[PDB]
Amino acid sequence: ASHMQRIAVTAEGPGLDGLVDPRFGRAAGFVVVDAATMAAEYVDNGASQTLSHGAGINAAQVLAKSGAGVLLTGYVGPKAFQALQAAGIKVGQDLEGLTVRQAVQRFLDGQVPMAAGPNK
Numbered sequence: 001a002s003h004m005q006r007i008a009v010t011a012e013g014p015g016l017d018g019l020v021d022p023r024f025g026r027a028a029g030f031v032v033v034d035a036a037t038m039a040a041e042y043v044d045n046g047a048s049q050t051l052s053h054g055a056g057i058n059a060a061q062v063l064a065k066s067g068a069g070v071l072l073t074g075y076v077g078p079k080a081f082q083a084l085q086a087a088g089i090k091v092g093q094d095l096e097g098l099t100v101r102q103a104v105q106r107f108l109d110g111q112v113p114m115a116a117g118p119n120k
Contacts, residue, residue, distance in 0.1 A: 001067070002088040005035040007107065008068035009100045014042040020103050022074030022096035025056030031100045032066050035108060056080025060087055072103045072112065081118040091115045 010027040012018055021027040026049050033040040043066055048055040056076065060083035063071060071089050074096035084091055092112040095103045106112050 002064070002069040003067050004069040004090075006032060006066070006068045007035055007070045007072060007104055008032045008043070008063050008066065008089075009095075009103050010071070010073040011042070011100055016040060016101040017099050020072065020074065020095045020098050020100055024071075024073045024076040025059045025080050027059065027073070030063065030066070030068075030071075032068055033100075033104055035104070038104075054079075057083050060084050060089070063087065063089060070107065072107055075120040076115075076118050077120050078118045081115075093119050 008030045010021040010024055011031045012021045012028050027045050029045040030043045031040055032043055045059055048058040064087040072092040072095050092107055093115045
């Protein structure tokens with residue numbers, strides 16, 4: 001099942017100080033962090049990027065497998081959003097321009113509204 005304190009953040013590559021990837025289904029990967037801990041791992045999303053369609057569905061399935069309960073990102077389309085809701089994952093949007101560390105910190109500080117629908 002999804003664990004609320006496992007926060008996935010779309011990422012352009014590994015590391016807490018890299019920027020959040022504005023894209024979801026075709027992100028390079030996800031930095032997944034335990035809010036307490038803070039232990040982190042990098043989950044590669046290369047498989048989703050090779051697909052002609054259904055990348056956000058595949059990415060949502062990658063996240064459900066990691067047990068993530070929150071996803072922080074820039075943009076997410078309709079089918080990806082539905083797949084995330086289906087998996088029980090809360091979505092934070094519009095986080096491009098932040099580092100991964102900063103997005104998790106803004107989320108924890110209550111500064112990230114959970115999204116009600118896709119924004120693209």
